[PDB]
Design a protein around this ligand. Sequence first.
Ligand SMILES: COc1ccc([C@@H]2Sc3ccccc3N(CCN(C)C)C(=O)[C@@H]2OC(C)=O)cc1
Ligand SMILES: [Ca+2]
Ligand SMILES: [Ca+2]
Lengths: 1274, 46, 49
Amino acid sequence: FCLTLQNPLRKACISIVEWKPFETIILLTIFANCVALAVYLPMPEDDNNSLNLGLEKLEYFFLTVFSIEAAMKIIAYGFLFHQDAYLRSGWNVLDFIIVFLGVFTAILEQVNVVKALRAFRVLRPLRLVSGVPSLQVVLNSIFKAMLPLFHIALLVLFMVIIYAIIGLELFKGKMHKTCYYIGTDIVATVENEKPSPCARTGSGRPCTINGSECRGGWPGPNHGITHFDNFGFSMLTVYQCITMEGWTDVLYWVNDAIGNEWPWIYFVTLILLGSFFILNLVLGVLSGEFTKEREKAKSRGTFQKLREKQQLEEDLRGYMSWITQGEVMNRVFRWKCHDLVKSRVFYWLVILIVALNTLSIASEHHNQPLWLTHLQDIANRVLLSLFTIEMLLKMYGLGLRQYFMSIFNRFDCFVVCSGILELLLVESGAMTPLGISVLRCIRLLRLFKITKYWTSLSNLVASLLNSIRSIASLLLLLFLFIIIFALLGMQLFGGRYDFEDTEVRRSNFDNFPQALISVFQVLTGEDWNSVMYNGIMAYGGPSYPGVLVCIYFIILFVCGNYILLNVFLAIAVDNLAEAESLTSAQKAKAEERKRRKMSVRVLCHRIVNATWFTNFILLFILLSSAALAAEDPIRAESVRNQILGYFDIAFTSVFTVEIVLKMTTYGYFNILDLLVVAVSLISMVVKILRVLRVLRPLRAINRAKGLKHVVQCVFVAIRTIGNIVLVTTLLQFMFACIGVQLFKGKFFSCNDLSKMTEEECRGYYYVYKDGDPTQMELRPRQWIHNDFHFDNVLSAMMSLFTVSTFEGWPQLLYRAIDSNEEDMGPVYNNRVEMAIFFIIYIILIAFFMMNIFVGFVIVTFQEQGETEYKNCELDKNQRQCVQYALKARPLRCYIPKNPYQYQVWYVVTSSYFEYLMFALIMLNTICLGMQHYHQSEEMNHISDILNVAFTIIFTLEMILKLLAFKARGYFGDPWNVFDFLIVIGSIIDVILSEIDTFLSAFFRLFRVMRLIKLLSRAEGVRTLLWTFIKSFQALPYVALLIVMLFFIYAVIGMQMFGKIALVDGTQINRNNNFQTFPQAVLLLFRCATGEAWQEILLACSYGKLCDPESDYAPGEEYTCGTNFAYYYFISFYMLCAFLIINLFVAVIMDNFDYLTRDWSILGPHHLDEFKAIWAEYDPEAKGRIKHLDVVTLLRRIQPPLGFGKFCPHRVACKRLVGMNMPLNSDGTVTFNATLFALVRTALKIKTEGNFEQANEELRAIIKKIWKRTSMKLL
Amino acid sequence: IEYYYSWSFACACAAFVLLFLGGISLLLFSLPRMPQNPWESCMDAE
Amino acid sequence: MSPTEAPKVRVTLFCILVGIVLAMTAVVSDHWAVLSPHCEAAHFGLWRI
Ligand SMILES: COc1ccc([C@@H]2Sc3ccccc3N(CCN(C)C)C(=O)[C@@H]2OC(C)=O)cc1
Ligand SMILES: [Ca+2]
Ligand SMILES: [Ca+2]
């Protein structure tokens, strides 16, 4: 704010004017500009209205102000080295780039007296954030957590590439055939089927439309967006499957192409690998990054601020009662109402009239009886009095000064007043036609009074409200991020959905309210592919300019779901840490209070004691189960179902013998193993006993010692968690009861949308196919009720659960926005303000209230990592680090002899060779991405040549890498074992290809799998893959509950839902079904990812028609399915979600050391580089090296462990000697304590004398003896 | 005109099912282990 | 020793030695195509048909 190369003030006075409101008169100016973009209404094909013609003048006015002021800051400074300076701060580079490109589009639009340069105009709400420096530390809290997620993002990119070149080579050009009406170009479907690929005499679906034939002139399955037949459309359709919206459409379109049995392994392996497993790494690095910063907020000063001011507040509220209870004390009558209140008579009988108010509210429903209408005005008039009695008792009988001091009594006086507001307003004839129900929505506040009865989360609800200058500083910056993308898509896509189809694309970008709703839907992830397909068909199509629209919705979905993880996860982590530590400090505050006031048989055991017997039971449990697996649902008479039915009596020989044998030696888990055979013997209603036969696996978690341990750790984690799960189900219940006041009776609708009520919705009507007004067909019209609706509290909670998950919530948003009146069909964009119900519900539940479940688990499983306390001399890192130095073992590197052979060896392992082969692999990928569909023949041959040309080269790196290591050393390094595997199968790719032309697809995949050798160099990524793959193998039991839970739910599902017929057009079709056990498991997987599971649920509920290969008494075709489907599917979604974030959190808490490593100080990545240079002197292990080597060995080490960047004549001549070391012979010094000695200089500096007490901390902190302390003490 | 098998298909599509599955198991049983701990390395002495 | 003396590697290797002949069954058996016109049945293999 000075010059140094300054110009006199005459022109420098300007600097004075810049004082306090000068910044805020132009910060007020820009909020007027943001409204000036939000009322611009985009209109198609160069059309306008009056208000956009008076706004373009306004743009000119706005531009000038920015320019005048962005000229009066470079000359409020001065010269060229003073506008050099203003620019210097990067916040004023954006402020110049906007307003210079601002006047550029006032010029070029006035020369042609363009519209893609009218979209830099949307960047001006960022100029708003440079003005408030309070938010510049908030963006820099989001950008600062992105440099750790670097090595994850690079790993997603070598999987979106790998599955693209796999999916190119297999799936290219297959999906170009559809059923067509004979001799037309009209594609044939059923009413509710989207058009799919078919095959002629293959394994695909044969066309079965009647008068339909299968031909190949078809462009693709979503107009040609999602196919696999060049590298850009293979990479766009794989990226779609990773985000898990509509991966089961790509899977089922391949099953109607090439066939049914092989392509499932592509989509399932991919989904798990790039979705359920990347999302494990993202929630580990991010979880560890938010924990290493709370330690650096512990270590600056910030702990006392939420402790002192907390305890300065509760001592302030307590010191107020020591005066104000003596401001009052005036009869016996004013005292006996004080003994009344604090007694348990009152706190257990005011909870009686809260429960009368819930039951009054939770009995509203549509078409309710006239008595229960009349009852609820009596019970409102009563419960308004009983709240008013206990307020007038409270405002006088204990004084109005204690009353106002409370946080919760402030609510009560309002509720009594706002309840008596209604009985004065509605008893007037001043009914106010909408406010007669708004004040019915008001009295819904009375059930928020029950929140006071928790008193278990009021260390979190307290800790919440301490952070609401910080909660809201993030929910603003998310809310600013939408308003750029809300308004960018009003440019690109406003108007522009001017299709001539008769279908509705309601998630469009026409207004500002609508654009905002659309942007949000793509952030919840739900159905964003439809919003993207419309943006590609809004431009040309699947062409070269039209498809770069697709990178709007990639920057939108990636970088917008990145902000969601930096807010909800962080809030739940930082806010949860305080709500726990303060409760754990109310531990130590309270137990220090309570101590002040106090102060033949014998053969049989051997027979079932032997290991073989225990294992003999297990392969009869692993076989008893897998006969339920292969059982036929549809036929109770099959030759298979008989020959598997004999195993019901063939396995209950052995499980009958053992239970008699068990009860000789003896006489909880034990009774179930009797109970399994009990059902298995009585089954030798008949149907309902087969269901209880499913528990044959559950008698296998009595046998394993490991399987008992996991199910007990899960039941621990419900007794903890089951405080949050109950509060949500209270808050779920409130929003359910608003929805019955808004949307009750309103979700009826006729069949054609012209008939508004039920009396008119009779008779028949026309439908027009493809909107041709010549191709019409009768249908009867019928008044259909919606499926998921809000009509009582029970169905309103059914609907809310689905929205909370994120499935099918836009079809409830539009059924609500279009909602008209009481018993009447819809009206287009009637209530566009009722998008706030479904957004406030989602922001509360599905992004926040749920974020406390994971945050809670992550935090309270660092308490299982903190009920074990090891307060020795050594810090855990030191101790963990120390553990390294004891338990090591050197490597083998097999440096050769025979200097012919050596002459290869140095040339191979040099980095100008590692660059050479890691360029040829990079070139070999580009040749595989060149392949495409309807390519020419001059590519067909140079495809096949380079298939031979590369294969010879990676052969010739393998003959050389045999010569240098002489075989024994080549098969020691397991990348070379994989490299041997690739070289062979690549040769068989050549030979098997040519011998057909000289006279299968699997060996084409050894051309793509050679890319995985990139992992042999990325030490930052190969460590990250190793550390998370180490710990899926280390927890093989939690991943066997999820295996077991899919097994049980499939077999019950095959049982009840197995006879639903495969009509096509519904959700039980030839791709989705419970008619085998692989079909069922696959179906369960669809629901665990949440594809259309609520739309599956409706498709298997009693009404559905049975297949004819079943049997039934005829006249009962429409009888199968059952209303057990609601219990089946809602229970499955809640158990699987619990058992997955179980397995997610357990993997984080093994890598809790890596994830929070703090790379600066000392780690094993330094300690790896010891054994690297230790390999340089011992080729094979053999213990020791010479003493002269340790002179030269030590300069090879980085100064965070070794010696500095100085010339080592001063320290190393001393530190090698003056620091103690084990003294072996003249040419011997051991491996392990050499490593122990050099970390001891870095960490744990101990003086002379502690050579045995440092073996005392190395023998009490230590475990098993490991008697090598003789070579590790001194 | 059908296709049917009671000998060769179920032996050769057992021999495939044998040899593909045993060699992979033989492969996993001579590669060392996932190192589980920051000092171990595949290919470490003995 | 420890990769080659273990019971998991010697159970495995003998199970390799079983199915080495099961292909050699199929290499001289000709049985896994049964034609049925109805007589004109055929029995196809790898050499003999
Ligand atoms: C059944 O399979 C699931 C999937 C997701 C979850 C929870 S909550 C949730 C609920 C509904 C839809 C998505 C979610 N998401 C999706 C948001 N993320 C992309 C940001 C999660 O990430 C949560 O998982 C975690 C560890 O974050 C739990 C079980
Ligand atoms: Ca979804
Ligand atoms: Ca979905």
